[model samples]
Target chain A: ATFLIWPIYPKIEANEKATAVWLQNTGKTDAMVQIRVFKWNQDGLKDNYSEQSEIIPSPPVAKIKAGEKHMLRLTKSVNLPDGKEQSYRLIVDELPSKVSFQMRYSIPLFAYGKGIGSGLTEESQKLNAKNALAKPVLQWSVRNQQGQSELYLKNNGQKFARLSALKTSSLGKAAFGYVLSNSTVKFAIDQSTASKIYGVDSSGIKQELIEITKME
Target chain B: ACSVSASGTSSISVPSIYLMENGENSSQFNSGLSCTGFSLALANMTYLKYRVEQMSNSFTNAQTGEKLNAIILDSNNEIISLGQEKDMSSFTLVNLFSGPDGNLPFYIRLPAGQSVSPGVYQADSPLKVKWFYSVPAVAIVGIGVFFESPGFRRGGIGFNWGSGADSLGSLSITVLPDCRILAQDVNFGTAAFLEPVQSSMGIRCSVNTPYYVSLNNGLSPQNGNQRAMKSTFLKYDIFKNSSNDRWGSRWSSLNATINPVTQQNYVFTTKIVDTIPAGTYQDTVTVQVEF
Candidate 1:
């Protein structure tokens, strides 16, 4: 009578239940059913999930028969503390006499740690922090022939954390740069990074950018 | 010299009869069933069987791979040959039944100075008895023996012949055998675990290990009197080209020597070199003794 199918969850928050939606094969005959998301948490952490999710609208369902399975998803998604893992399943019903006989998983969750910022490593912070814990950066070297530069960011902070771009840039444009607290960080001073300068108020001056390569 | 005369139709008690060697009342008789009465009716069958007033066991060396010869006549002293036009002097009659099939009735007669040693013998090879005769409403089953013995003989022997067809005297031949070996696999080896579930198999004639060389007596022939000494043991070797290789000869062996005269039973084990390139294989062993 009831057929639960695909389920998707938003970025999980600690001590909170996640919500997900799934597609249904409401028709009598078989359907090309599938479940996809915009982002995923392999290590179970807060991330720009949608950046990793895929979308393959309709899949082939030559197997399932008519009036067999009605698809459904979980109402209250899974919840876990930091460092926990998550996974998903896509079940299908093809047999007539049997009750929901088949269920196949879409993919495995290797990086899906139950907690936020699970993808961040200590090496990631040390590489991001270099400015004596203030504005960390790495020493840059330049080759005569090659037209390129580099730097390293250090976290130096006592606490573990994640970072995201300020609400807006000086010129009011969206940017990228998720941060982890108190870890070495590596920031690239490319055209994209140059556009992410942030300000506290409309009247406040934009903070001066820290360049690790310029440091002794 | 012996002769046989039977009516196509006979009284139940004397349904068919053959003239005993040098005995009286061995002449032809007629009850409206004599083939001698109608020559045309005599040639109607492909083959025939006649019970020569004796059991089939009476035949000379009548065992496996035993050779037999039959002579045909046209109411005259002149002899005839098989339809295949092969020689009639000494015809070959190898064993015809073995595993999967039941032993059948058969017989043959030989001239003076042609007596055969008695005992069981095994076919040097496998044989088949097809109920081919089943195809025709009038024919008895067709039996075809694949191998033969060395020589055959002939002269004054009578045979009674009948078939599903004419039940009235069908076809007849006096089968005279040469050397013969009985087809058998009696207790000749130590198969440690083979259990006898029936009376026929339990107390059959038996022998001990190295039977051919030993004084032990069984039914299957081995060393000395059956074949040679080097050929005493079964030798088999198989090889393959790759790590995954397989080869085998189920039971047949050209490696063992048989001693026909000194041995009544033989038990040989072929150290088969069961190795070969990955593939399937199967074979069987065949042993024949000359009487």
Candidate 2:
């Protein structure tokens, strides 16, 4: 518990490759931190995480003295909004040379790239001909496979859905996760009898029990 | 992410800390500085205020799931509670010294008189923090009371409550348990034949850690009792208190937990039931300790 980071949420603006972040050492000893980037995706309820080079941190490792701060740059190698919005996790870890009942870590994430669109978006679905990946087109359903029931969400639109605070009637515990554009992701429901669902949308307003698009 | 962003800049991740035996220990990261001044040019203000809400109230172990009692101490040694809505606008600036950079201090430690277990313990919850910056007109008015828009600054002011997408940080601590024998030498100087010889051995271990100690029968033993010298005729034994409460075991122990670098002693006595031959008599015993 000796350090602090800046821009906990950093973004590489559309067409930009890098952004700035800060790390400060508030402890009495010299310290080092290792930051790693992972391409993040959810498969059903589990995470599909693999090391990726697309968005790497400059000075992937940081060494700082007590009472000092250092800057780290998160850089992406490609442009944004050209496809589905991407998600990545910057895992920050501390190298405790002398651990005495203490270990360290924290994560701050942000991405750059402009959305080629207007507003109300989630409510203004123009699902006609053009504009495929402009916003999040979401649908929910439940499926039973093997002995488990799955809470599935399909993003028919182009944007990614950052779903959280999800609650189903049979939810032993709420399952919150993301579903990428044009893709279907299943989350463990743990129960079969639930007709309603609740989730927090991109904005503050809560999205009520959504309509089921499919029974399969 | 602590929303320290009323106006100036902020840092991500909850600050972490490693504790020391004496005095205070600060966090590894600067809990973001607040509300820099706008001299109409570059923004660099030193009025630093802090608000911290710990993720976990205690230190937890990673493997065994054991936990140690610890607290994040403020500058004055006040306990920082987890998830409590505390604002530094109410705290003093005596501890968090900031120049043009930001708030560069935070602390974590074990409560006094509390001993810890050996092995590593980590704080499971990441901290949620709030940092406020004051670019007040007097500047000296920064620590005591916070002024929203200060007293006539003719400038703009912002507050950072960390409303951003901020994820918490990690912290782990390790405690090494150790024990050792201080090597006691017992001398029975010029004692009459059939006289009793007595001395004691000292053993100590880290604070709070339990220890087990034992001494085997010397070279030779009188059954379950006293040990023998080279002649196997003379006998002696190690004791803690009563004659029946002998100090002998396999390194598997009778445990005792002590405080403040505790050291305990056991009695070593020789029983000379009969007159011995006037020759040099000596014996050795192995005293082992496990913690």
Candidate 3:
């Protein structure tokens, strides 16, 4: 329901290197969905799995239109402990008509699962993890002179999420920044800056964000 | 049950109402030069009307009549008098002074022991005190009815007659039978391109899908030689005549024929001219067998 991807089986090295999985919807319906990650331990021939967020191509939620797909790529910057061949379940589920973080989501999903794991040594894992450098950060500012306020947002992630779409209140005036795997971005809003931007001295504000991240 | 010769009538009151503004001892106008009184006239126009009263000529002494305040009385006869001895600018208006004006808020009812014939009558019949104004002000008011009963057989006439046994015996009969169209597996193959047949004497049909069906004697077409014969067929040359050089399914079939269609359960199918405007369509089919 959420997304579709090609190459059901994907390979990855123990070291951090870029690997991508795209959401391809060959069907006629658009998939507005979420992605969940899990790891599989293939012992001998049988397999058991655990959850992981490192290779997630999308945030908890994403959207993929019909006939178009999004490719999610991630570098397992650090190797797994005693890295070896293992299986992973990249489950994709459709988002519900409504969304609220205040409640626990047992979202029902129509998923296309994929297997991804590292077979490199520890040294390879650490090397890949260190090699996984965060992408450049995107920055933007909004100035409303009539309202006496301004807002600045910085995204330090490989993905880009617009800050205006998610209507937010005071605490959310500056929407979240999409920082890369191990990076962080800053958003600032102050009365002085607001006064300079928005001529009004008492104007308040609201903000929201759109996050773009690795989907593989 | 209703007999042909029986008849009866019922009555009910349909109430209606309207507005009137000017009436009795109320607000003064033109700085107190005159007043206005209102009434209802059922003559030409069955509605409320008003008249202006000149109160200036009634003033007496030049000193004692320095200012004559207006007094308005409500339905309960409670008085609110505004005059020379009272405060002018601070006078409140809720003090009801006239009948059925903006100040008085109440509805009237037909008096006790009163009965109105079908003919028109003024509400509260021979009503008194429509509305009045003590100040030189505009008087507006209205008239209304609480309940009215209309006559029976109000609109049009309709009837039916019968004579005793002169013509023929009247057949007073009724039938309630649940008739269903029962058709099982029906495969006509190239035979589907046959002429349309009328199951009912005249109603034409070609295909019948498998499903629950019902019909009156002449309602739906049944499968029979006579019914199937109603339709006909002709040579089908699809690709040879079409622009595309290939005949579509509709133009590729041959004459239609049916096996013994004796089953109460019937089957039906068709490959029709997919698109056709409403008009006469002629075709034919071969009768293979009939039961």
Candidate 4:
């Protein structure tokens, strides 16, 4: 069935301009949907969403016919953090299903500077392009823990490091989905591990070397 | 007589480009490097832009021993080229033209002056295309004045861009029932007598969607319902849960409301009613998900 929202991540400005998101019903059955807004944060790798008064979603609930689409309007009501990027989440939950399981998507919503449209000013374009290209630099460390080695990873940059595929020669590969900017994680490693660790970058263009050392 | 019209639908056609090997078509690039073998057709569009990216990291030119580079050509003799073993990371949008003269056809060719070898050359990349269009604005041009004139209508003289007022279309969501099941086979290891074994399967699906699970009798059966182990000819039955009630060919639910965490583990109980001989015994059963 058709059940998806396009452009999962939306960029909104705090200046209270109108923006919209599309919810598609790809399934053959009609679906009832509910939209809710929340402030988003991460604590030790776990994501947390809190209700806030900064933003509002117009007509939060509606019925979508099968093979149709719904447009939800979003507006900023209060100003968010200004120094760095502020984040929120819009949760669209499928309300009615005869089956035991239902679909739900908590999409990211980012608040930037004053609003800009398709025809962007030179300065706005330059700054946005620079922010979009922000790359993550990763730091790695290995430690000995009881007869096993613990692999430590840290992303010390403005962008998230999505290490989709990570494999060490002596140890099996680990799928570390993403280490948000400035976050760290540690995982158990195989004993006879070492050599070049490899995975695809965020773009999935090529396999990148993640780490190049064998743990004894 | 070139004139602008109202908004309309436009289409872009992508052609299939194959790597020729000997006299046959192949997906491999090394042996059959047809320099000018690929093309794309654009229709009903005023402007077009596209870019190509290499999907695989190992693709290289046979002759120069360097990465293969692509050169694109259009009907207006415009050319756009990518690579000399470049970063392969950036996307450069190439603007194109199309008109009433006819839809423009694009051609793809390998870079010039290279002695490519005969072998299997491979690379995977996709081309992305985007465009804009306009069509005749009004269905019946002069007729709008009749409705707009003050004498015919109470309102004063009205004006339209000959194309009528801006046409608005709505976007709505169409919900469908989608389900995904990732299950593993139920394995009953070595057992001496009539012993019960337990196994489980995983299921995931769209929100608020309803579905039924059915399990078919295995490789061998007796009394038209009892499942059997092929090697020892042992009789057994599988239950939907630990309750010991036989799990027949009936639709059953997961008993929980569908939500974002839609994954559920369904446990099945397997029991041997009659004891049998030794040796590795096995049976295969079909599992189906009906929505």
lDDT string, candidate 1, A131-175, tens digits = 233222223222222354433333332222222223243221112
Regions more than 4 Å wrong, model 1: A1-9, A13-18, A22-147, A150-175, A180-187, A190-216, B1-291
Candidate RMSDs in order: 40.8, 19.9, 35.8, 18.2
Each model's C-alpha lDDT? 0.24, 0.48, 0.26, 0.45
- Going through the candidates in order, their DockQ values are 0.00, 0.01, 0.00, 0.02
Per-residue lDDT of A95-203 in model 2, one digit per residue for the tens? Answer: 4300011122223244534543222122222321245555566777876778788767877766555554565432322323456656778866564454445555431
Q: After superposition, how far is residue A67 of candidate 1 from its true place, in Å?
A: 16
Off by over 4 Å in 2: A43-46, A81-83, A97-134, A168-175, A194-196, A202-216, B1-291
Residue-wise C-alpha lDDT for candidate 4, range A78-130, written one tens digit per residue: 65454244557787766330002244554556554433211112233444455
- Interface root-mean-square deviation, candidate 1: 39.0
Scored by lDDT, model 3 comes in at: 0.26
Clashes of 1: 94
Kept native contacts, fraction for each prediction: 0.00, 0.00, 0.00, 0.00
Please provide, for model 2 over B68-185, each residue's C-alpha lDDT reduced to its tens digit, 9 standing for 90 to 100: 6555655444567655544343233423444454443445655444344444466666565554444333334343233332232223474443332222445555554333344444
For model 4, the local distance difference test gives 0.45
Misplaced by over 4 Å in model 4 are A9-19, A53-55, A74-83, A87-89, A97-99, A106-133, A142-150, A168-176, A187-197, A203-216, B1-291
Give the B-chain TM-score of model 3: 0.14
**Model 3: per-residue Cα lDDT over B1-291, one tens digit each:** 000111111111211110011111222211211112322231221111122111121111121222111233323333422232221211233232333333222222222222111111211111122121112122243332211111211114632111111111111001001111211111222332233222210111111101111111111123321111122321121122213332111210111222320112222222232322322232222111100
Most DockQ-accurate candidate: 4
Candidate 1 chain A has its poorest 10 consecutive residues by lDDT at A93-102
Least lDDT summed over 10 consecutive residues: which range in candidate 4 chain A? A114-123
What is the CAPRI rating of model 4's predicted complex?
incorrect
Summed backbone clashes in each candidate are 94, 53, 73, 42
